[PDB]
Design a protein around this nucleic acid. Sequence first.
RNA 1: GCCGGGGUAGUCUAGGGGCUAGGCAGCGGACUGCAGAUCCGCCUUACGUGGGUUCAAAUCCCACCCCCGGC
Length: 336
Amino acid sequence: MPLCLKINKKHGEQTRRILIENNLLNKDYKITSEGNYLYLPIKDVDEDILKSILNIEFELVDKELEEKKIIKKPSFREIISKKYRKEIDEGLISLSYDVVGDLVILQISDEVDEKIRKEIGELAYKLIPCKGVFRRKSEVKGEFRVRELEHLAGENRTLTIHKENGYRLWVDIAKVYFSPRLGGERARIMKKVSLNDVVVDMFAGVGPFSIACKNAKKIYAIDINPHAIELLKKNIKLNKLEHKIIPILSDVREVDVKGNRVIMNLPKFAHKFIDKALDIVEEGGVIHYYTIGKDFDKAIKLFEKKCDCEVLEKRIVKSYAPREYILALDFKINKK
RNA sequence: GCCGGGGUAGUCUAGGGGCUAGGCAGCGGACUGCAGAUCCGCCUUACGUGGGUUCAAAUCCCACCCCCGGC
Ligand SMILES: C[S@@+](CC[C@H](N)C(=O)[O-])C[C@H]1O[C@@H](n2cnc3c(N)ncnc32)[C@H](O)[C@@H]1O
Ligand SMILES: [Mg+2]
Ligand SMILES: [Mg+2]
Ligand SMILES: [Mg+2]
Ligand SMILES: [Mg+2]
Ligand SMILES: [Mg+2]
Ligand SMILES: [Mg+2]
């Protein structure tokens, strides 16, 4: 209410933290000053209880509207649930989305008319710091582990530069696999690496795991996807790691390399490469293994039925599907 | 070296004199299942360093240190 307290600049702040504290500060208008006076817009209540909640004198001057700019914009989650409640209650739109670089990717069901998907994309382009909005069009389809997309708003380019854990990376969300949600898992690995380790990243994609191991001596980044290597090379030079990370284009099975730290970032077919990974890792070395399952028992069983190994750590990385998870196990391979 | 835009909670991004940020990650639950997923709870005041204007600084000033692009 225009009914705003009028004190002298001097005890401004002190007096303001009291008005807000007692929840009597009308925060929909700006504070103002004219000379040595301070005009705090208060809510309303006889200056008899105001003459008590504080001890300095004042007055109640009722002034016009100085308007207050809207601070924050609402949230994508906040709005889609109010505008599309029906389809949400139908599980036909996700309030979750991820951001790779400066591009966003939403999940909207095929039922949703082509014209509304665009209205949603156009509503996420407006409500989220980005330059483009897409939509998942399929699951991660084998081989190069790529996922079909669909443009919905903004710039129609699939290239961009994601920045995580102190390093930057070139990514093409259209021809190469990349997950901005796996940065936590890379930080995990980042700490385990050693100044003397030699790291073999069996399926390096664009190199997020490789660059993450910048503390090691040498690093081999292998990938069968030709589009992967390109970015990988660029990623290597962009991070000043040329005489450290060696990119190789090939089927990891055909690579004759050797190392003490091996990363197996291929959750679904990882089990079909244990043989190569053990053939790669030096004795005493460790194998970062990823897989999909409801418990660790099955992975532990494979490895054991193949070498004397010790499970250093074993944790749950993320939910993979209804009641299924992506698991991570760090095996110490001593002998075999 | 000089101009610019910056350093934002673990991480990454918006904001830009008095409002306490949005995501991921993390933690706890849920979903009995072709999903690198979704879904519900909880993380309720963080802005490089030193000093300076102001009743009030993450914001404005100056300086310095590092990023990022320019000549
Ligand atoms: C899960 S992606 C790597 C993702 C990356 N670590 C990330 O999170 O950003 C799998 C990669 O393994 C590669 N790949 C698939 N089969 C392979 C094989 N037999 N040998 C080597 N690389 C392979 C694919 O080309 C793909 O780039
Ligand atoms: Mg910024
Ligand atoms: Mg946060
Ligand atoms: Mg959980
Ligand atoms: Mg700043
Ligand atoms: Mg400063
Ligand atoms: Mg303040």
